[PDB]
């Protein structure tokens, strides 16, 4: 069949959130209140597109 099309490594470069899981869980409820809108844009895009390559930006 066809060739699967993957994004390049430049498309995956981003400033990673390099904090530990306790730093994430301690800051979790304020992250869920304050970072609501692009997170829900992303997860709606992620359950509608069903393809992570269409959900990168």
């Amino acid at each position: 069949p066809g060739i699967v099309e993957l994004p390049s490594l430049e498309d995956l470069k981003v400033q990673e959130v390099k904090v530990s899981s306790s730093v994430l869980k301690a800051a979790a409820h304020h992250y869920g209140a304050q970072c609501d809108k692009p997170n829900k844009e992303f997860m709606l895009c992620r359950w509608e597109e069903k393809d992570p390559r269409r959900c990168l930006e």
């Binding site: 997860m43 992620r46 359950w47 069903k50 393809d51 992570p52």
Partner: protein, 63 residues
């Protein structure tokens, strides 16, 4: 019986039996075509009902 009666009764018998024979030949041909192509109401061996599929958003998105 009159020869008229036997004669016309024989014509009636021959029409009924010729119709039944042509219908049996058509029945054989119809059964052969429906087993071969599977497009008629006969030989419809069952598949999975698609009403059983859960179309809800699942726990993970890649599906």
């Amino acid at each position: 019986d009159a020869p008229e009666k036997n004669y016309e009764r024989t014509m009636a018998i021959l029409q009924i039996e010729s119709e039944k024979a042509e219908l049996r030949l058509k029945e054989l041909e119809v059964r052969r075509l429906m087993r071969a192509k599977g497009d008629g109401p006969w030989f419809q061996y069952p598949t999975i009902d698609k009403a059983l599929i859960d179309h809800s958003p699942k726990a993970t998105p890649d599906n």
